[PDB]
């Protein structure tokens, strides 16, 4: 069973301030190609906003669907989201 959240981040000088693993060409978990947050950097954007959590699974970045993408694609969806990034995530 999962909990869902929409999170809006303001890009900072060191980026959005979290780290991601996963993707169809780099499964973080067995048989799961999802994009997982693996770190929330102390003092960074994701940390100060306060809502993202480690292992949160990113479903959408703005309107791009990253449920089924390569890792480089998911990284680029986040790099090119602009200054105010809308993230749709699920957890539990």
């Amino acid at each position: 069973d999962y909990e869902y959240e929409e999170i809006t981040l303001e890009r900072g000088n060191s980026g959005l301030g979290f780290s991601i693993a996963g993707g169809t060409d780099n499964p973080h978990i067995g048989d799961d190609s999802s994009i997982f947050i693996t770190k929330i950097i102390t003092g960074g954007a994701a940390a100060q906003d306060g809502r993202l959590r480690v292992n949160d699974c990113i479903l959408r970045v703005n309107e791009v669907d990253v449920r089924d993408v390569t890792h480089s694609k998911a990284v680029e969806a986040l790099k090119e989201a602009g200054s105010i990034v809308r993230l749709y995530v699920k957890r539990r």
Partner: peptide
């Protein structure tokens, strides 16, 4: 992983 990747820092974003």
């Amino acid at each position: 992983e990747t820092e974003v």
